[PDB]
Design a protein around this ligand. Structure first.
Ligand SMILES: CC(C)CCC[C@@H](C)[C@H]1CC[C@H]2[C@@H]3CC=C4C[C@@H](O)CC[C@]4(C)[C@H]3CC[C@]12C
Ligand SMILES: CC(C)CCC[C@@H](C)[C@H]1CC[C@H]2[C@@H]3CC=C4C[C@@H](O)CC[C@]4(C)[C@H]3CC[C@]12C
Ligand SMILES: CC(C)CCC[C@@H](C)[C@H]1CC[C@H]2[C@@H]3CC=C4C[C@@H](O)CC[C@]4(C)[C@H]3CC[C@]12C
Ligand SMILES: CCCCCCCC/C=C\CCCCCCCC(=O)OC[C@@H](O)CO
Ligand SMILES: CCCCCCCC/C=C\CCCCCCCC(=O)OC[C@H](O)CO
Ligand SMILES: CCCCCCCC/C=C\CCCCCCCC(=O)OC[C@H](O)CO
Ligand SMILES: CCCCCCCC/C=C\CCCCCCCC(=O)OC[C@H](O)CO
Ligand SMILES: CCCCCCCC/C=C\CCCCCCCC(=O)OC[C@H](O)CO
Ligand SMILES: Nc1nc(NCCc2ccc(O)cc2)nc2nc(-c3ccco3)nn12
Ligand SMILES: CCCCCCCC/C=C\CCCCCCCC(=O)O
Ligand SMILES: CCCCCCCC/C=C\CCCCCCCC(=O)O
Ligand SMILES: CCCCCCCC/C=C\CCCCCCCC(=O)O
Ligand SMILES: CCCCCCCC/C=C\CCCCCCCC(=O)O
Ligand SMILES: CCCCCCCC/C=C\CCCCCCCC(=O)O
Ligand SMILES: CCCCCCCC/C=C\CCCCCCCC(=O)O
Length: 390
C-alpha cells in the first residue's frame, strides 16, 4: 500500500542538512571577510552582511523548522504557524536587502558627488533595523489572524491522535493559499522584484548615457581643432573656439585634473582674444598648443572616467545576477502555489515536486558567496587570505 514514508523522508532530511552546512560555512566566510578587510567596509557591503545573516539563519533555524513541519507532528496551531512562517521573515529580509543594494548603486551612478553625504553608515544601520522589524511583521502576518487554525481538518487531526487545541502540523493546512499567492507572492515578492528590475535598467541607461557624453565631448574637442587648422576667416576660428570652451567647462563638472582643465580653458581664452583682434595665424598657432594639454591631461582624465564607469557596470551586472538567482530559486515554489489556488479542477502537484521546490529555494542561501568569489576581486582575495592562514 505505497512505499514507506521514512524512505523518501530520509532523502529529504539528508539533502536539507547538506544545504544547511553549506549555507552556514559560506555566509560565515562573507561576514568574516567584511569584518577583517577595510576595503569591503562600505555601505553597499553592510546590506550584503544583512543578506548573509538571513542566509546563516536559513541553515541554523529555517531548515530544522522545514524538517519538523514535514513530519506532520501534533502541535498547538500558533506554534505550528511560527515553524511554517519563520522562513518568510528571512525571505522578506532578503528582498529588502537586495532592493537597498540596487538603490545604493543607482545613487552612486546618478549623483556620485553627493553619495558620501547622503548614503552614510549610521543611516544604513537604521534602514537595516527598520527592514528586519518589517520582515517580522510581513512574514508572521498569519499569526495575527490570517490562518486556518479556526477551521481545522478534524479527520486528519483525530487520525494523527492530536489533543485539544492541537493540529497535524502541515504547511497547507495552517497557512492560507490566498495569503501565500496575493500577499506574500504578488505584493511582497513580485512587486519589489519588478522594482529592482526597473532600478537596474536605470543604472545601465545612466552609465551608457554618461559614457556616450564623455566620447561626445572628446570628439567635439578634436573635430573643432581640425576646423581651426582648415579655417581661412576670423569668424570660423571664433565659432570653433566658443564651442570648444563650452565643452571644456561642461567636462570640468584629483587637483591635477582640475588644474589641467584650467590651463585648457586659459589657452582657449588666449586664442579667442587673438581671433577677436583679427589675428588669424596667431590664433591658429595658439590653438595648436591645446594638443599638448590634450595628450598630457585631457586624455588621462577621459581614460580614468571611462574605467570607473566600466567598473560600475561590471559591479551592477554581478549584483543583478544575485537578484536573478533569487528569482530562479523562489519562483517554482511560488508558481506551484498559484496552481493550487487558481486551478481547483487541476490535480495537486506531486509530493516529490513540492519538496524539490522547497530544496531549490533553500539552495539560494548557498549561491551568493560563490558569485562574490567569482565576480568580485576584493572578496576573492580576502577569501583566499582567510582559508590559507586559518
Ligand atoms: C532564536 C533561538 C533562541 C531559537 C528559538 C527557539 C525555537 C526553536 C522555539 C521558540 C518557540 C517554539 C515553539 C512554540 C510552540 C510550539 C507548540 C508545541 O505544541 C510544539 C512545539 C512548538 C512548535 C515550539 C517549537 C520550538 C520553537 C519554534
Ligand atoms: C523556473 C521557473 C522560473 C519556471 C517555472 C516552472 C515550473 C514552476 C512549472 C512549469 C510547468 C508546471 C507544471 C505543469 C502542470 C502541472 C499539473 C497541475 O495539475 C499541477 C501543477 C503542475 C505540476 C505544474 C507545476 C509548476 C510547473 C512545474
Ligand atoms: C516572473 C513574473 C513577472 C511572471 C510570473 C507570472 C505568474 C504569476 C504566472 C505565470 C504562469 C501562470 C499560470 C499559468 C497556468 C494557470 C492555469 C489556470 O487554470 C489558472 C492560472 C494559472 C495557475 C496561472 C497563474 C499565474 C502564473 C503562475
Ligand atoms: C499590489 C499587488 C497585490 C495583488 C493584487 C491582487 C488583488 C486581487 O485581485 O485579489 C482579490 C481577489 O479576491 C479578487 O477575486
Ligand atoms: C535549533 C532548533 C532545533 C530544532 C527545531 C525545533 C523543532 C521543534 C520540534 C517539536 C517536536 C515536538 O513537539 O514533538 C511532539 C510530537 O507530537 C511527538 O510526541
Ligand atoms: C533566547 C531565548 C530562547 C527562547 C526559547 C523559548 C522556547 C519556548 C518553547 C515553547 O514555547 O514551547 C511550549 C509549547 O508551546 C507547549 O505546548
Ligand atoms: C530574547 C529573545 C526573545 C525572542 C523569543 C521569541 C520567540 O521565538 O518566541 C515566540 C513564541 O511563539 C512565544 O510563545
Ligand atoms: C499585481 C498583481 C496583478 C493582479 C492580478 C489579480 C488577478 C485577478 C483575480 O484575482 O482573479 C479573479 C478571480 O479570482 C477569478 O476567480
Ligand atoms: N505550498 C507549500 N507547501 C509546503 N510544504 C508542504 C508540502 C505538502 C503539500 C501538500 C501535502 O498534501 C503534503 C505536503 N511548503 C511551502 N513553502 C511555501 C512557500 C514559502 C515561500 C513561498 O512559498 N509554499 N509551501
Ligand atoms: C537541488 C538538490 C538535488 C535534489 C535532491 C532531491 C530533493 C528532495 C527529495 C524529494 C523526495 C520527497 C520525499 C518527501 C517525503 C516526505 O517527507 O513526506
Ligand atoms: C545523517 C542524517 C540522517 C537523516 C535520516 C533520518 C531519518 C529520520 C528517522 O530515522 O526517523
Ligand atoms: C540540531 C539540528 C537538527 C534538527 C532537525 C530536526 C528536528 C525535527 C524533529 C521532528 C520531531 C518529530 C515529532 C514526531 O513526529 O513524533
Ligand atoms: C542548540 C541545540 C538545539 C537542540 C537540538 C535539537 C532539538 C531537536 C528537537 C526534536 C526532539 C523531539 C523528540 C520527540 O518528538 O519526542
Ligand atoms: C533533479 C530531479 C531530482 C529528483 C527527481 C525526483 C524523483 C521523482 C519521484 C517520483 C516517485 C513517485 O512516483 O512518486
Ligand atoms: C547544493 C548546493 C547547490 C549549489 C551551489 C553552487 C555550486 C557552485 C560550485 C561551482 C564552482 C566550481 O566550478 O567549482
Amino acid at each position: 500500500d505505497g512505499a514507506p514514508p521514512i524512505m523518501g523522508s530520509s532523502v529529504y532530511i539528508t539533502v536539507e542538512l547538506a544545504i544547511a552546512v553549506l549555507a552556514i560555512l559560506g555566509n560565515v566566510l562573507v561576514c568574516w571577510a567584511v569584518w577583517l578587510n577595510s576595503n569591503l567596509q562600505n555601505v553597499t557591503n553592510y546590506f550584503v552582511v544583512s543578506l548573509a545573516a538571513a542566509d546563516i539563519a536559513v541553515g541554523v533555524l529555517a531548515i530544522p523548522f522545514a524538517i519538523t513541519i514535514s513530519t506532520g507532528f501534533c502541535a498547538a496551531c500558533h506554534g505550528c504557524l511560527f515553524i511554517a512562517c519563520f522562513v518568510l521573515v528571512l525571505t522578506q529580509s532578503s528582498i529588502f536587502s537586495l532592493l537597498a543594494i540596487a538603490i545604493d548603486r543607482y545613487i552612486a551612478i546618478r549623483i556620485p558627488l553627493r553619495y558620501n553625504g547622503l548614503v552614510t553608515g549610521t543611516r544604513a544601520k537604521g534602514i537595516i533595523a527598520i527592514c528586519w522589524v518589517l520582515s517580522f511583521a510581513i512574514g508572521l502576518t498569519p499569526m495575527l489572524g490570517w490562518n486556518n487554525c479556526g477551521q481545522p481538518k478534524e479527520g486528519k487531526n483525530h487520525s494523527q491522535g492530536c489533543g485539544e487545541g492541537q493540529v497535524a502540523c502541515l504547511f497547507e493546512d495552517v497557512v492560507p493559499m490566498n495569503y501565500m499567492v496575493y500577499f506574500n507572492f504578488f505584493a511582497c515578492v513580485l512587486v519589489p522584484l519588478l522594482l529592482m528590475l526597473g532600478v537596474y535598467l536605470r543604472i545601465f541607461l545612466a552609465a551608457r548615457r554618461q559614457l556616450a557624453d564623455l566620447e561626445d565631448n572628446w570628439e567635439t574637442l578634436n573635430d573643432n581643432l581640425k576646423v581651426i587648422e582648415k579655417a581661412d576667416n576670423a569668424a570660423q576660428v571664433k565659432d570653433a573656439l566658443t564651442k570648444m570652451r563650452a565643452a571644456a567647462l561642461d567636462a570640468q563638472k584629483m587637483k591635477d585634473f582640475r588644474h589641467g582643465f584650467d590651463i585648457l580653458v586659459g589657452q582657449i581664452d588666449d586664442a579667442l582674444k587673438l581671433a577677436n583682434e583679427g589675428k588669424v595665424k596667431e590664433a591658429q598657432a595658439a590653438a595648436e598648443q591645446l594638443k599638448t594639454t590634450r595628450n598630457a591631461y585631457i586624455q588621462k582624465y577621459l581614460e580614468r572616467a571611462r574605467s570607473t564607469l566600466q567598473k560600475e557596470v561590471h559591479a551592477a551586472k554581478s549584483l543583478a545576477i544575485i537578484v536573478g538567482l533569487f528569482a530562479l530559486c523562489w519562483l517554482p515554489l511560488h508558481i506551484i502555489n498559484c496552481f493550487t489556488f487558481f486551478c481547483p479542477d487541476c490535480s495537486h502537484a506531486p509530493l516529490w515536486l513540492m519538496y524539490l521546490a522547497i530544496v531549490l529555494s533553500h539552495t539560494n542561501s548557498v549561491v551568493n558567496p560563490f558569485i562574490y568569489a567569482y565576480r568580485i576581486r576584493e572578496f576573492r582575495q580576502t577569501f583566499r587570505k582567510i582559508i590559507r592562514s586559518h
